[PDB]
Amino acid sequence: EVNTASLCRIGQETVQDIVYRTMEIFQLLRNMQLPNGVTYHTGTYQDRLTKLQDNLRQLSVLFRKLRLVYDKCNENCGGMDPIPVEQLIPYERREIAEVNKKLKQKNQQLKQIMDQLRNLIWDINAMLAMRN
């Protein structure tokens, strides 16, 4: 209904991905060789501009989503209207605990399976001395 925490996480992921996309497109257009290649007639630059436009659309929709989530965050001002900045320096959850215990049991089971898989998977280290 609110998902403000997930909204902030998505916004952070989006701005990080925007920076990543900037770096990637710089690395991409870095080796922009002569379009009129001696050997290559029309091969490279086509896919180059294709990926260029793709990354452009990507960063455009990224900016759009950023603006949208920022507007959503700044509009839904519910809870702690004062919001004391000086309140960040120190001097039911039953279902959560049940899900955590179930996940831990599944993790231990998977770990036992992986432990068995270790011995079942080495399988060559002991007998590579005479393997062919």
């Binding site: 992921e13 990080q16 990543y20 770096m23 690395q27 257009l29 870095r30 922009m32 002569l34 590579l128």
Partner: protein, 270 residues
């Protein structure tokens, strides 16, 4: 054909000479502003005189260099631009050339300075190996080979000026589990029965092996394995001499080398 740098230097030199003589002549329009103690303006005068000597010496030094230009200027390449206005709309060509060069330089500088990234995290094929090996093998004085008798994993070796070959057996993309030897001491052609590993040396190249292992755990980029192996082989090539030893004398120990920053120096000191 890198004379462009020297010619730009000569340009700067003559510009500085003109500027200096103009400033010298302008300063002679008036005497000491408010000395009140002496006539120490002779100091600044002699400084300007020496600056003139510096300018003359630089002009002479640049006259000594820049021997001559080659005949047939432009090498018949812009003859189209030299052509009549019928076919030339021609300046567009030079414009696009300059634009491309500027964009290339800009992208390079941007990528270089963008090395300090801000990505807090990174989350939500037996054909590239041969291609990478072929690409790396085009490099000179560093011959490589591969047999891969173990299986899917990659097994390869490299050679240098001496017989100090290196045995590097790694996975598909990234280099790991390497070892070093020297002067056929490994004999990993048909050692015992085949291309054996034996993970050993005569207690001298152990340091080199440790350095290479550390480097493997240092150049481990998250992606772009081609760049990874290129950095790896460049790091390896830095041992072709093993003669100099800065930050010390070349007698400190058995050997001296640890260039992870593209510069070697006396080992056991970092």
């Amino acid at each position: 054909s890198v004379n462009l740098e020297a010619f730009s230097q000569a340009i700067s030199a003559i510009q500085a000479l003109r500027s200096s003589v103009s400033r010298v002549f302008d300063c002679l329009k008036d005497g000491m502003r408010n000395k009140e103690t002496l006539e120490g303006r002779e100091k600044a005068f002699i400084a300007h005189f020496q600056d003139n000597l510096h300018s003359v010496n630089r002009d002479l030094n640049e006259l000594e260099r820049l021997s001559n230009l080659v005949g047939k200027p432009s090498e018949n390449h812009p003859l189209h631009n030299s052509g009549l206005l019928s076919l030339d709309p021609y300046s567009q060509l030079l414009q696009a050339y300059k634009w491309s060069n500027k964009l290339q330089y800009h992208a390079g500088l941007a990528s270089g300075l963008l090395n300090q990234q801000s990505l807090k995290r990174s989350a939500n094929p037996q054909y590239v190996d041969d291609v990478i090996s072929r690409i790396d093998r085009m490099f000179p004085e560093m011959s490589i080979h591969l047999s891969r008798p173990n299986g899917t994993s990659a097994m390869l070796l490299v050679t240098l000026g001496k017989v100090l070959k290196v045995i590097v057996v790694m996975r598909s993309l990234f280099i790991d589990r390497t070892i070093v030897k020297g002067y056929n001491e490994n004999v990993y052609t048909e050692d015992g029965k085949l291309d054996i590993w034996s993970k050993s040396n005569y207690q001298v190249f152990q340091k080199v092996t440790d350095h290479a292992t550390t480097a493997l755990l240092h150049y481990q980029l998250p992606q772009m394995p081609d760049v990874v192996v290129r950095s790896f082989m460049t790091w390896l090539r830095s041992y072709i001499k093993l003669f100099q030893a800065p930050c010390q004398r070349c007698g400190k120990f058995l050997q001296d080398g640890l260039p992870p920053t593209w510069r070697d120096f006396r080992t056991l000191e970092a």
